[PDB]
Specification:
2 copies of one chain form a homodimer. By secondary structure, the first copy, chain A, is α/β, with parallel strands linked by helices. Chain A has 2 domains: 137 residues, Nucleotidyltransferase, domain 5; 152 residues, Nucleotidyltransferase, domain 5 (2-Layer Sandwich), CATH 3.30.420.40. Helices cover 36% and strands 22% of the residues of chain A. Chain A has 10 helices and 12 strands. In chain A, the strands form 3 sheets. A 5-stranded mixed beta sheet of chain A has the order 3-2-1-4-7, with helices on both faces. In chain A, strands 10-9-8-11-12 form a 5-stranded mixed beta sheet, with helices on both faces. In chain A, a hairpin with a 5-residue loop joins strand 2 and strand 3. In chain A, helix 1 crosses helix 2, helix 3 packs across helix 10 and helix 6 crosses helix 7. The longest helix of chain A has 25 residues. The radius of gyration of chain A is 19 Å and the shape is globular. The N and C termini of chain A lie close together (12 Å). Chains A and B meet through helix 7 of A and helix 7 of B. The structure holds zinc ion (ZN) (2 copies). One zinc ion (ZN) binds next to loops of chain A. Chains A, B: Keywords: ATP-binding, Carbohydrate metabolism, Kinase, Metal-binding, Nucleotide-binding, Transferase, Zinc.
Chain lengths: 289, 289
Amino acid sequence: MTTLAIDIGGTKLAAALIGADGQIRDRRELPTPASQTPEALRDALSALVSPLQAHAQRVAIASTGIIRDGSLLALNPHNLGGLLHFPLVKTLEQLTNLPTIAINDAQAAAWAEFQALDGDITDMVFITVSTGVGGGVVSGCKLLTGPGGLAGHIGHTLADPHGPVCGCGRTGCVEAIASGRGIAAAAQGELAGADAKTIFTRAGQGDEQAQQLIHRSARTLARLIADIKATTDCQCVVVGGSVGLAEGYLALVETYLAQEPAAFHVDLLAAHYRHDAGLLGAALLAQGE
Amino acid sequence: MTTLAIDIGGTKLAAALIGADGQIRDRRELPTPASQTPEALRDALSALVSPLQAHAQRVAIASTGIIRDGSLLALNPHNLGGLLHFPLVKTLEQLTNLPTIAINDAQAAAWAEFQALDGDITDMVFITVSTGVGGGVVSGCKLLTGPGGLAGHIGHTLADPHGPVCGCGRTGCVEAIASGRGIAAAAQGELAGADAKTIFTRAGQGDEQAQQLIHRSARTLARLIADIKATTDCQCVVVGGSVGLAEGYLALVETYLAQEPAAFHVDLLAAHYRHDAGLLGAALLAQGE
Ligand SMILES: [Zn+2]
Ligand SMILES: [Zn+2]
């Protein structure tokens, strides 16, 4: 059995063929349509999966946003345009005639990271810090998606009631402070307008402000991890994404978490997959269907 | 078959016989020993359950603090004295010769509250606000205890990084602001020294400081509920405890939650059980054993 694995992001629509061995084969890519209409996405998904769909027996989609009742939702619904409640699972099922599942991309990535761990771990939380902050919760070897697909949206838990307004509408989410976008938005002076990448580079050269923006991110993430430990009693936390995997970042988080009381401590690990974890995690979930 | 349900708290040790009908029968009570030695707790438990133990098939203990490997832990290990790592399950097993389970009291209460709900809810979070703040998470009709018995400790998640220091050692926990002890601790002027009950009365009479202390607690709890919704995707939140059940309190929490973006909204319900939910929950959890 081969899974047609799809990753639906904001900028790119990716698809691959993944068999039982978990290898990524025939990796295809298309840009995400600028026009956010249901017709345009159905066109782009059909075009993306055509040359692959005869070689697969089931479809699995990792999507940015929220999947509820097989349909596309977001924390800021206005960002989807005409794609709000787009029937994502039904669309593929019509286009391919193949059984289809859809999950949030950070939930998909979480499952992949969990399966990459040793067999003794039953409870794990995954956090990705990139442009945004996403998460996924595994409890008793089961991925928690939630009845509405929201579970693990830990980037949108509170970091500071007097912090910046987040894109979701809340004041002071973890994401508004700790993400690459929040790091960049807090930048003043000669750092104003620089992206997270540049800021990490400047911090590497001993730029004090750049360093503090990153310390603030890592401190925010450490407190989140303490929160999640208190809530879920996870046995380890896997940290990924372009910010999360940036050199020295995990060490910073670990150092700040160590300052919390011993009961809130949890083992931290670097993400095993740098790329394509959503694609992989989606295919792995489709194997248990 | 009948469960010898036990509730171990800071002040009082309670025990009852509870059959399949859920009727609390032959309820007894004893004060918790001031000398926190294992010998004194063993004696006080032995005395409490000796008239009941010949009429039960199993023991179930709802306990304050943390239950890890059948032993007593807390978020402040110094607060247990010689009772840190007290082999709670083992003690009962030796005293009664009955199969014994132990669980956190708020986790116990959560399970009872979940069962008293209608059949459609699969995902529920329980929050109790009294002297402290405790919780329990039910996901997919299963109570999440956590591998170390921690899960659902939502009173000790972050409310404000510049908030008051909590008894667990963290700065700015929900509990340190929103709980009855949190409300009493922030009272200034003539209000200083008044308990949460007095503060609640004076608030209803138009005392602006007292009202601010309760508004602050209600607002803090709303933000916690928004966090928990983001993390668990719970379908409803049941709120209990002397503070949580206080007149007007839940409606105020509900008002504050409604100011958050729509995705963070979740139905709030008053606790079905005002007393003895721990005993009931423990016996209910013992039934599925
Ligand atoms: Zn947010
Ligand atoms: Zn605390």
